[PDB]
PDB file of C-alpha atoms in Angstrom:
ATOM      1  CA  UNK S   1      93.631  92.918 105.076  1.00  0.00           C
ATOM      2  CA  UNK S   2      96.003  90.981 103.104  1.00  0.00           C
ATOM      3  CA  UNK S   3      95.555  92.926 100.121  1.00  0.00           C
ATOM      4  CA  UNK S   4      95.751  96.602 103.015  1.00  0.00           C
ATOM      5  CA  UNK S   5      99.152  95.113 103.602  1.00  0.00           C
ATOM      6  CA  UNK S   6     100.767  93.882 100.252  1.00  0.00           C
ATOM      7  CA  UNK S   7     100.124  97.870  99.785  1.00  0.00           C
ATOM      8  CA  UNK S   8     101.763  98.847 102.496  1.00  0.00           C
ATOM      9  CA  UNK S   9     104.539  96.845 102.843  1.00  0.00           C
ATOM     10  CA  UNK S  10     105.321  98.381  98.884  1.00  0.00           C
ATOM     11  CA  UNK S  11     104.598 101.740 100.528  1.00  0.00           C
ATOM     12  CA  UNK S  12     107.433 100.100 102.777  1.00  0.00           C
ATOM     13  CA  UNK S  13     109.682  99.118 100.687  1.00  0.00           C
ATOM     14  CA  UNK S  14     109.988 102.077  98.428  1.00  0.00           C
ATOM     15  CA  UNK S  15     110.324 104.231 101.612  1.00  0.00           C
ATOM     16  CA  UNK S  16     113.184 101.826 103.229  1.00  0.00           C
ATOM     17  CA  UNK S  17     115.014 102.061  99.755  1.00  0.00           C
ATOM     18  CA  UNK S  18     115.402 105.825  99.840  1.00  0.00           C
ATOM     19  CA  UNK S  19     116.302 105.798 103.393  1.00  0.00           C
ATOM     20  CA  UNK S  20     118.745 103.390 101.942  1.00  0.00           C
ATOM     21  CA  UNK S  21     119.552 106.340  99.347  1.00  0.00           C
ATOM     22  CA  UNK S  22     120.092 109.091 102.115  1.00  0.00           C
ATOM     23  CA  UNK S  23     121.970 107.428 104.821  1.00  0.00           C
ATOM     24  CA  UNK S  24     124.024 106.135 101.992  1.00  0.00           C
ATOM     25  CA  UNK S  25     124.869 109.743 101.166  1.00  0.00           C
ATOM     26  CA  UNK S  26     125.641 110.456 104.267  1.00  0.00           C
ATOM     27  CA  UNK S  27     128.039 108.325 105.344  1.00  0.00           C
ATOM     28  CA  UNK S  28     129.606 108.389 102.050  1.00  0.00           C
ATOM     29  CA  UNK S  29     130.029 112.098 102.349  1.00  0.00           C
ATOM     30  CA  UNK S  30     128.839 112.106  99.150  1.00  0.00           C
TER      31      UNK S  30
ATOM     32  CA  UNK E   1     100.277  84.441 110.269  1.00  0.00           C
ATOM     33  CA  UNK E   2      98.594  87.452 108.781  1.00  0.00           C
ATOM     34  CA  UNK E   3      98.196  88.521 112.554  1.00  0.00           C
ATOM     35  CA  UNK E   4     101.677  88.109 112.812  1.00  0.00           C
ATOM     36  CA  UNK E   5     102.256  90.082 109.307  1.00  0.00           C
ATOM     37  CA  UNK E   6     100.043  93.033 110.659  1.00  0.00           C
ATOM     38  CA  UNK E   7     101.253  93.355 113.642  1.00  0.00           C
ATOM     39  CA  UNK E   8     104.885  93.351 112.737  1.00  0.00           C
ATOM     40  CA  UNK E   9     104.504  96.009 109.843  1.00  0.00           C
ATOM     41  CA  UNK E  10     102.434  97.816 111.966  1.00  0.00           C
ATOM     42  CA  UNK E  11     106.327  97.635 114.011  1.00  0.00           C
ATOM     43  CA  UNK E  12     107.945  98.451 110.631  1.00  0.00           C
ATOM     44  CA  UNK E  13     105.861 101.493 110.085  1.00  0.00           C
ATOM     45  CA  UNK E  14     106.772 103.592 113.156  1.00  0.00           C
ATOM     46  CA  UNK E  15     110.345 102.510 113.069  1.00  0.00           C
ATOM     47  CA  UNK E  16     110.163 104.190 109.448  1.00  0.00           C
ATOM     48  CA  UNK E  17     108.448 107.210 110.662  1.00  0.00           C
ATOM     49  CA  UNK E  18     111.561 107.633 113.235  1.00  0.00           C
ATOM     50  CA  UNK E  19     114.174 107.495 110.302  1.00  0.00           C
ATOM     51  CA  UNK E  20     112.861 109.200 108.812  1.00  0.00           C
ATOM     52  CA  UNK E  21     112.229 112.717 111.276  1.00  0.00           C
ATOM     53  CA  UNK E  22     115.701 111.620 112.278  1.00  0.00           C
ATOM     54  CA  UNK E  23     117.412 111.541 109.136  1.00  0.00           C
ATOM     55  CA  UNK E  24     115.500 114.419 108.091  1.00  0.00           C
ATOM     56  CA  UNK E  25     117.130 115.790 110.985  1.00  0.00           C
ATOM     57  CA  UNK E  26     120.188 115.130 109.987  1.00  0.00           C
ATOM     58  CA  UNK E  27     120.071 115.974 105.809  1.00  0.00           C
ATOM     59  CA  UNK E  28     118.541 119.636 106.734  1.00  0.00           C
ATOM     60  CA  UNK E  29     120.680 119.928 110.480  1.00  0.00           C
ATOM     61  CA  UNK E  30     118.355 120.803 112.146  1.00  0.00           C
TER      62      UNK E  30
ATOM     63  CA  UNK H   1     100.579  85.932  98.097  1.00  0.00           C
ATOM     64  CA  UNK H   2     101.290  85.764 102.144  1.00  0.00           C
ATOM     65  CA  UNK H   3     104.411  83.812 101.994  1.00  0.00           C
ATOM     66  CA  UNK H   4     105.682  86.174  99.425  1.00  0.00           C
ATOM     67  CA  UNK H   5     104.379  88.457 102.390  1.00  0.00           C
ATOM     68  CA  UNK H   6     106.290  86.821 104.822  1.00  0.00           C
ATOM     69  CA  UNK H   7     109.825  87.365 102.723  1.00  0.00           C
ATOM     70  CA  UNK H   8     109.404  91.157 101.659  1.00  0.00           C
ATOM     71  CA  UNK H   9     108.315  91.569 105.794  1.00  0.00           C
ATOM     72  CA  UNK H  10     111.087  89.260 107.004  1.00  0.00           C
ATOM     73  CA  UNK H  11     113.406  90.778 104.911  1.00  0.00           C
ATOM     74  CA  UNK H  12     112.936  95.293 105.915  1.00  0.00           C
ATOM     75  CA  UNK H  13     113.044  94.295 109.083  1.00  0.00           C
ATOM     76  CA  UNK H  14     116.700  93.622 108.518  1.00  0.00           C
ATOM     77  CA  UNK H  15     117.075  96.690 106.095  1.00  0.00           C
ATOM     78  CA  UNK H  16     115.456  98.667 109.054  1.00  0.00           C
ATOM     79  CA  UNK H  17     117.544  97.390 111.856  1.00  0.00           C
ATOM     80  CA  UNK H  18     120.763  97.635 109.791  1.00  0.00           C
ATOM     81  CA  UNK H  19     119.492 101.898 108.926  1.00  0.00           C
ATOM     82  CA  UNK H  20     118.848 102.106 112.717  1.00  0.00           C
ATOM     83  CA  UNK H  21     122.746 100.626 113.910  1.00  0.00           C
ATOM     84  CA  UNK H  22     123.487 103.301 110.458  1.00  0.00           C
ATOM     85  CA  UNK H  23     121.069 106.166 112.271  1.00  0.00           C
ATOM     86  CA  UNK H  24     122.336 106.199 115.590  1.00  0.00           C
ATOM     87  CA  UNK H  25     126.834 106.137 114.764  1.00  0.00           C
ATOM     88  CA  UNK H  26     125.939 109.188 112.875  1.00  0.00           C
ATOM     89  CA  UNK H  27     123.351 110.449 115.801  1.00  0.00           C
ATOM     90  CA  UNK H  28     125.837 109.507 118.596  1.00  0.00           C
ATOM     91  CA  UNK H  29     128.880 110.512 115.982  1.00  0.00           C
ATOM     92  CA  UNK H  30     129.647 107.777 116.413  1.00  0.00           C
TER      93      UNK H  30
END
């Protein structure tokens, strides 16, 4: 259960970093 | 503590999937 | 490993709440 949590958290961090970049582009009009 | 982590990770995955859909709509102009 | 997971999940929750606010502003044209 801890290894499952670790993989899903790593996948969320990647997905969150992707969202942050996309939203910054939207906010800044890049 | 592991069960708390599991519930919060499941809630983050739902919230992240909601954000992904909303951002795709914004990016694609849907 | 559980404490590392806890800190990273807390950081994701903050980052996700920031994204939610920013996306709501984008969607509502605030």
